[PDB]
Symmetry: D3
C-alpha cells in the first residue's frame, strides 16, 4: 500500500496511563506500566498507523510528562504541530486490568489538567483545519473544562466554513456529566456532524433515542431514526457482549445509504480492551476516506477494533494488511 | 459501609511464597515473585479487608523474612500483636502457576519452621481470645509439628470457656498425614467447632463421612449427616469443577437451620487460585458475624472466593461493594 | 511504649528505574513518602508507637499509602479519609553531574483541602511524648496553618515536646511568606532541624562561609539566642555530585556544637535522608543520649538512609550503632 | 524411572529467540525475553529431559551468543560435544506471541549464520554417529545454506552404514523454498528415513501426496499411502485445529504395523506453542526407543506436546511422570 | 528553524540489564542508535529541524527505529525503506576493571546495501544549514563511499557547512584503508571531530605525549595546516575504568586551543558521549558561540550524556548551560 | 583435558534487585552458588574438565542447580541425588556504609545429610589432577568430616594435588571447633588458600599489623614452617565500604612472597571473589605459571569477578590476561 497525504485532525485530551502489571491491583503493586492515551488521541494514532497525516490537537504542560506524551504520539506517526504547551499538569488515569469476573477499574486523576484549563485563544482553528479532509471529536471532551465546549464550537464552525467532514464518537460517561447536561450540549453540535459513532447507551443517553430489543432489525431501526433526525451520512455502532473481563463478543454495524451492514462477530480473549472503540472510529474514518464500500467498511473496522483488544496500551500497532487478513476470514 | 471493631482471631502458619513469573517453571526462571501467605493468615487478611479487627496468631523468626511476613500482614490491616518471635527459619513454598493441562505445582520447604517448633508457652490464649467474637483454625496446622495439636487444644478450651465462636476449615492434605491420623486428631476437635468449612474430600477423609453422587441433593444429605453427628450451627462447602488449570467452575453451599443454600456457579479464567478456599471461609465468617441471611451468606461468599481467583497472591484485595456487585448478578 | 506523632502529607512517588529519565521510561517504580511520614517511619522502625496524621482519599492509592505506613509499623488510626486524590511526585534519580529532578503533582490533594474539624488534637496528642512537623506543610492548603496551630496549642497544653524541620521550599512559597507563618510557630518549638538555606529564608538569620565549624556553631547560637531552642540539629551535605557526597551533622545543645564523623557516600537514594536525621535526633532525645552520641547516631542513621531505595529507612538500632561505633 | 545411556543425535540450527514480554509487539517494547531454540535442538532437549544421551550437532560462532546457546543446551542436559565452532554470527528470530485473533508473528534474521555457511568438513559423521541408536533431522535444514543438503546426505549415508534409525520431521516452510525444490531435495532423502513425522500440509507439499477430507479414515489412508511408497516403519502426524492464537485443539496419530492410533484430543489455552511439534517428535522417538506399544506412543506423545504448549520457550521442561499423568486421563 | 542533516546507520542495540554478561542474561534491554543518528537526536533535542538520512527494512524493527527517532523529535522523511534486515549490536555495559564489550551483527543491513538512487541529495540538502557524517559509514557497504560523495558534492554546491567525525574503527577497516577514502573527503569538511587515535590512523598525523595541552594544541594546528578546517574538536577521555573517567574537550579555532573544564564521571552509559560532543559543537557553531563557550557547552553536554541510559541524549539547553556555568 | 574435582554444598541464592532490602522486595533474583561450586565453575570456564561433587534433592531446585553448573561447563556426573531440600541463602547486596547481609537457610539440606556411601571416591578421583575443598563443608553435617577424610585418603593414594580454602565461618563453628577437624586435614593439603582471619582461628597462628607486606610474608612462612605447604595464597581486601574496595593478593612459594598489583574496585557483586582467586591459583599451578605471574593472574581474575553479578565468573583466559598485563 501507499502513504496518503490526507490531513486529518482530532481534538481532545491525552493522559498518562498507569497500570499495574500482570493483573495486579493498585494496592499490591511495586510498579506501574506507563503509556499515554485518550479517545481522540487513539483515533489519531490509528489514522497515522494507516499512513495518513494525522494531527492531534491538545494542550500539554511543559514538563517531562507532556514531552513524553508528545513523543509517544510522534513515535506512532501522529504530527504534534498543533499541540499547545502550557498549564500545570498532565491528566492521569490509573487502570487495573481485570480478569474473568473482576472488571477493569479506572481511577481518574485528570482534573485541573492543562487541556481542562485551555482557553479559546490557545488554538488557531483556521490554521489547524487548513487543508483538512476530516475532523474528529468525542463527547468525553466538552465536560472536561470550562472553555472546552466553546473551543469545540470554534473548531466546528471553521470545519463547516471549510467543508471539512466531521465525525463525533458520542462516548457518554456518567462520571463526567448527567444525560441531561450531555443532551443540552451535544444535541446542538449534531448540526455540524456528518458521521456518528456510538453504542446503544450513548444514543439513549446523549440523543434521547431508543428502541425495544437491544437483534439486527432493532439496531437498523435506531440508525434510521438518528439518520432522519440529524441527516448523518454514516452511522457506525459498536456491539459488545461483555461475557467477562476476559471474553467478549464483538461486532459492528455501519449504516449508510439507508442500509445497515453488520460485520462478522468475534469472540475475543482480551489482552487490553482500552482503545477498541477508538480504533473502530479510526477504521471507520479511514474507510470513508478511502471510499470503501459499506460492507467493507464494517468488516475492516470490526477487524481492526477486534485486533486492538489484543494489543497492550491505548494505541493500535497495526498494518492495513493485518486487518484485511482478519476481515477476509 | 463502616469499620466494625469485632475481634477475630486465626492461628496457623504463614510462609514465604516464591513463584516464577509468567507461567515459567522453577527450572527455567532467573527470578521469583515474592509474597507471604497461609490458610489461616489468608482468612485473617480477608476479615481485615472487610473492616473487622483480625489478629493472626503465629510464630516467626527474628530475621528479615519474618519481619516482611509481619509487615505484609499489617499492610492488609491484620493486627500482629500476638505473633510470637523466635526460632530459626520461616517456612517457604515454591509455586509454579499452571496453565491449561499443566497443573500448578508446589514444592514445600516448611519443615523446621519457627511455628512448627513452637511451644505451648509461646501463646497466652487467655490474653489472645479476650473479647474475641470468633476463632478460626484449619486442619493443615495440627500435623505441622510436635506441640501444635496441644497448642490448638489449649486455644479451643479457652475459646469454649469464653463462649467464642469457633470455625474449622478441614483442609485435608495427604502430604501432611494419613486419613487415619487426621481422623484420630480432628474428630475430637469437632466437639469445640460450631461452623465447618470443607469440600467433599475433606469430609470423606477427615470425618469418614460419604454419600453417592458427588448433585445438590447429595451435598445437602452430606451436610445433614455431619450436622447430626457434630451439631454444627453452619456447614459451608466449596464446589470446584477443575476443567483445567486455566478454567474452573466454582460455587458453594451454605447449610444452616436444616437447609441447604446453593450460590450461583461461576466459570472462572483463573489468574491465581491460591487462597480461594480461604476467602470463602473469610467470607462465611464475615457473613455470620454480620447476620446475613443464609442465602446471602452463600452468594456473598461464592462471589468473594470467585473474585480471589482473579487476584495475584494469597490474600484478597477486595471491598464489600465489589463482592456485593458480583453477587447481585 | 512511647507515643510519638507526626503530621503532614504523604505522596505517591513515581520514579523511573535504572537512572532513566521520565521521557524515556515505560514504567515507574512505586513507593509512598513524605517528610513527616518518613520521620514516623523512622521512629516506628526504632520501636516507638509512631502515629502519622494526615488525610487521604478513599481510593486504592490512599489505601496503598496507608498500607505502606502500616507495613513499616506506623499507626494509621488518625488518618482522616476523604477528598478527591492523593498527591504525587515524579523523581528522576540522577547520576554524577546530572542532578535528580522532581516534578510535583500534589495540588488539590485530600490533605491540601483538609479542614480543622478533620483532626481531634486532644485525642491524637493524648499520651504523646513528642510531636514533629515540617515547613513543607503550611503552604500546601488554606487551612493547614490553622490546623498546625490547633495541634501546637494542644501540644503546649499537654506539655508535649515539639520538633520542627524548617524545610524551606521555594516552589511552595517565598522567603517572605515562610517568615510570616513559621516565626509565630517557633514559640512552641523545642527542637529545630534545619540547614543553612532554611535558616536564612525562614528565620532571617545569615552567617559567612557555609556553602567550617565555627561558622556553623555561630549560626546555631544566634538561632538559639533568638528563639531559645533546647536543641539545634543541622545536616551538612557536601554535594560533589548526584553519585558521591560527603555527609555529616551538627547537634547544638547546652550552648555547644557537636559535629559527627564525616561519611563519603556513594548514593543509592538520598530522598528521606534529612528526615531520618530528624527521626534519629528525636529518638536520641527520648532515649537520653548525650549530645555527641546524639550527633553520631543521627549521622550514621541518615548516612544509612542514602543506601536504601525509597523514602523510608529499613533499619534496626543495632545496624545504626554498628556504623556509629567506627 | 532410570537414565538410559542410549545415544541419540539431531542436527540443524539453533537460533537466538527474542520475544517481547506480555503480548507486546516489537514496535512497542523496551525489552526482549531471551532464549535459544530450533526444531532439531528442541528434539534433543526433549530426549535429554527424558534421560537419554542426546547430542545436538550444529555450528555456532565463537562469540557470547554462541556460548550462551551452547550453555542453554547443556543446562537442559543436551551434550554439546559435536558442536562445531566458527563463522560470523548466530541466527536470530524475533517472535511476537499472539492472542486471540492476532496471530503470532515471526521476523527471521537467520541468513549468513555460522551453520548456514557450514562446510562438509566441519562434521565427522563417523565419530558423531558411532554408537548412536537414533538420528533425527527436519526439512527446515537443507534449504538454510549451500552445503547443508550435502552435509545431511553425508550424515544419512553413515547412519545407513551403521544401521542407525533415522527420523525426519518434514517441516515444510514456504519462506525457505518452493514445494517443487522441497520435493526435489526431500524425496531422495526418504530412502534413508525409517520414521516420518509430519502434518497434512507437509505431506501434500513435500511428498506430493494428498486425500479428500482433511476425519480419522482420511488420515489413516494418507499414512498407508506414504507407508506403501516409502516403506516407513512409523508415521506420526500432528493434528492442530487453530481456533485462535489463544485456543487450539490438539491430537496426534501414530501409524505402525498397518494401523492407525489416535490420541486423546486436548483443548489448550496456549502459553507458548513454539516447539510443540518438536516435542511430539521427541516423544515419538522416545517411545520408539522404549518399545512403547503403538497406542501408548500416541497418547504419550500427544500428552507431551500438549504440555509443551504450556511452557514458555522452545524446549520442554517435563518429567516422564508428568506426561504419563496427563496421558492417563 | 534551521534544517540540519546527518547520514549513517542506525542499529537495534541489545544490552543485558544490571551489568550482566550476554552469557548470563534472560533478557536484553532494547534501544536504537548509531553515531550520526545520535547527533541528529542531539540537534533535535536542542530544537533544530534535524533530519536523519538512512535506509531501514520494512519490518517492525525498521518501524521501531524510525519511531524512536521521531519520539526524540528527529524527522524521518528521508529514510529510504527496503532491504532485508536491520543491523544489530549487543552491548555488555562494563564495570570497574571489566570494559564494556560490543558484539557487532550489522553485516547485510538495508543501509549496507543501499544504492545511490535511494537518496535524492538535491531535495535532502535543500535549505540545509549543516550536514554531518562519520567515518563509520563508508566501510559499511559497497556504494556508501559513492553515496557520501554524492551528498558532499551537493553540500558543496549549496554552500552547506560540513562536519565529519573520523571515528576510525579497526573492525571495519585498516588504517591504510581509511586513508584512501577519507582524505579525499576532507576537501569538503569544514569542522573536524576526532581523537588522538583517529587522527593517527585516518589522517597520518602523530605527536608525542597524548595517551598535556601543548601536545593536543600541536596536533590540531598540524591537522589545520594540512586540511584547513574552520574548527577542530577533540574529546579527551582519561579512562581509569568502566565506572569512573575524567572527561574534557578541546575546541581549536582561530588558530588557538580552548580546553574545557574537566569532569570526573561515574558513568551510567557512555555510549553516544562522543556523538553528543559533536552535536553540541554543531549547535554551538550555528548559534555563534565564542570558542571557549563552545568547548564548555560541548563538554557539559557530553558529560551529561554519560548519565543517561541509551545512545541518545534526553537534555534541554537550560540543563547543559546549568552544568557549564559551574 | 585435565580432570579437576571440587566438593561441597551448592545453594539457591535469593537476592533482592537494585540494592533493595529483603523487607522491601516483591521479588528475588535467582542464582545458584557455593564456595567449591564456584571454584569448579572457574576451572570449567578456563577449559578444564571440572567436576563438582555434592548431593541435591530430586526436585526442581536441585534440577536447576545442576543445570546452572552444566551451563557453565561443569560436569555433574558425580552429583548424588536424594534428600529433602536444597540449602538457601538470601543476600542483600549492600552499598556504601551499609554492608551486604546474608540470611542462611541451609540446615537439613540433602548435602548436610549425605552419607559416606553416597560418594565413590576411587571412581570420582580416578585420573584427577586436582582436588579442592573448603572449611565451610565439614561443619555442615554429621558425616561430612568423614566424607572429606574418605576423599582425602584416596587423593593421597592416587597422588592427586590438594588445595583447601580455610574459609572459617563463625555461624557454623567455633574457633576451637575448626581446629580439631582441619589441622588433621592439613596432612593432605598441598596448597593453602586463606585470609588473616582464617589463619588465626583455624590454624592458631597470629601476627601483628594485618587489619603491610612483611607481616603477610611472616604469617605465610610461619604457616609453611608448621604444615609444609607448596603454596600459600592470601587475598588482601581493604574494605573502605560495600561499594569501593582495594584488592590484591599474595602468593607465597619457594619461601618467598609475591604481591600482585592493587586494584581499586567499584563493586557489582563481590560474592565468589575469593573462590575465583582459588580457581585462578589452581589453574596457574596446573599451567606452570611462575609465582609472580600466578599472583597477577589470580588477582586479575578475582578483581574481575567483583564486576560480574552472581557467584560464578563468566570469563575467558584472554580477558584475565588483558587486565593482568596493565
Ligand atoms: Ca489492501
Ligand atoms: Ca452493602
Ligand atoms: Ca520497561
Ligand atoms: Ca509479565
Ligand atoms: Ca513410568
Ligand atoms: Ca535494575
Ligand atoms: Ca530475567
Ligand atoms: Ca517488583
Ligand atoms: Ni503529508
Ligand atoms: Ni510510548
Ligand atoms: Ni478495634
Ligand atoms: Ni506484601
Ligand atoms: Ni510499600
Ligand atoms: Ni557536649
Ligand atoms: Ni551416557
Ligand atoms: Ni537458557
Ligand atoms: Ni478461554
Ligand atoms: Ni525508543
Ligand atoms: Ni579564543
Ligand atoms: Ni543459571
Ligand atoms: Ni566512586
Ligand atoms: Ni619468585
Amino acid at each position: 500500500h501507499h502513504h496518503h497525504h490526507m490531513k486529518v485532525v482530532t481534538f481532545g485530551e491525552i493522559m498518562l496511563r498507569l497500570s499495574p502489571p500482570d493483573h495486579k491491583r493498585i494496592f499490591q503493586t511495586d510498579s506501574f506500566d506507563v503509556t499515554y492515551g485518550g479517545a481522540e488521541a487513539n483515533v489519531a494514532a490509528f489514522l497515522a498507523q494507516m499512513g495518513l497525516d494525522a494531527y492531534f490537537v491538545t494542550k500539554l504542560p511543559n514538563n517531562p510528562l507532556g514531552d513524553a506524551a508528545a513523543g509517544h504520539l510522534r513515535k506512532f506517526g501522529v504530527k504534534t504541530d498543533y499541540i499547545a504547551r502550557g498549564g500545570n499538569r498532565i491528566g492521569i488515569y490509573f487502570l487495573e486490568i481485570g480478569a474473568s469476573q473482576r472488571p477493569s477499574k479506572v481511577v481518574y486523576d485528570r482534573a485541573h489538567s492543562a487541556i481542562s484549563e485551555a482557553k479559546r485563544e490557545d488554538f488557531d482553528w483556521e490554521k489547524i483545519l487548513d487543508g483538512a479532509r476530516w475532523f474528529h471529536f468525542s463527547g468525553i471532551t466538552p465536560p472536561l473544562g470550562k472553555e472546552l465546549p466553546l473551543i469545540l464550537e470554534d473548531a466546528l464552525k471553521v470545519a463547516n466554513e471549510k467543508g471539512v467532514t466531521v465525525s463525533c464518537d458520542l462516548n457518554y460517561r456518567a462520571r463526567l456529566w448527567t444525560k441531561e447536561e450531555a443532551q443540552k450540549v451535544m444535541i446542538p453540535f449534531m448540526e455540524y456532524v456528518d458521521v456518528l459513532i456510538a453504542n446503544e447507551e450513548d444514543i439513549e443517553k446523549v440523543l434521547g433515542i431508543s428502541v425495544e430489543g437491544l437483534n439486527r432489525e432493532a439496531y437498523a431501526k435506531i440508525a434510521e431514526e438518528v439518520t432522519r433526525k440529524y441527516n448523518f451520512k454514516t452511522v457506525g455502532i459498536t456491539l459488545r457482549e461483555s461475557i467477562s473481563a476476559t471474553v467478549n463478543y464483538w461486532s459492528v454495524m455501519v449504516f449508510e445509504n439507508g442500509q445497515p451492514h453488520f460485520s462478522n462477530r468475534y469472540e475475543i480473549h482480551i489482552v487490553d480492551r482500552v482503545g477498541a472503540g477508538d480504533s473502530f472510529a479510526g477504521a471507520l474514518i479511514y474507510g470513508s476516506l478511502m471510499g470503501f464500500d459499506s460492507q467493507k467498511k464494517a468488516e475492516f473496522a470490526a477487524a481492526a477494533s477486534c485486533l486492538k483488544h489484543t494489543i497492550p496500551g491505548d494505541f493500535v500497532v497495526l498494518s492495513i494488511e493485518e486487518i484485511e487478513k482478519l476481515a477476509s476470514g
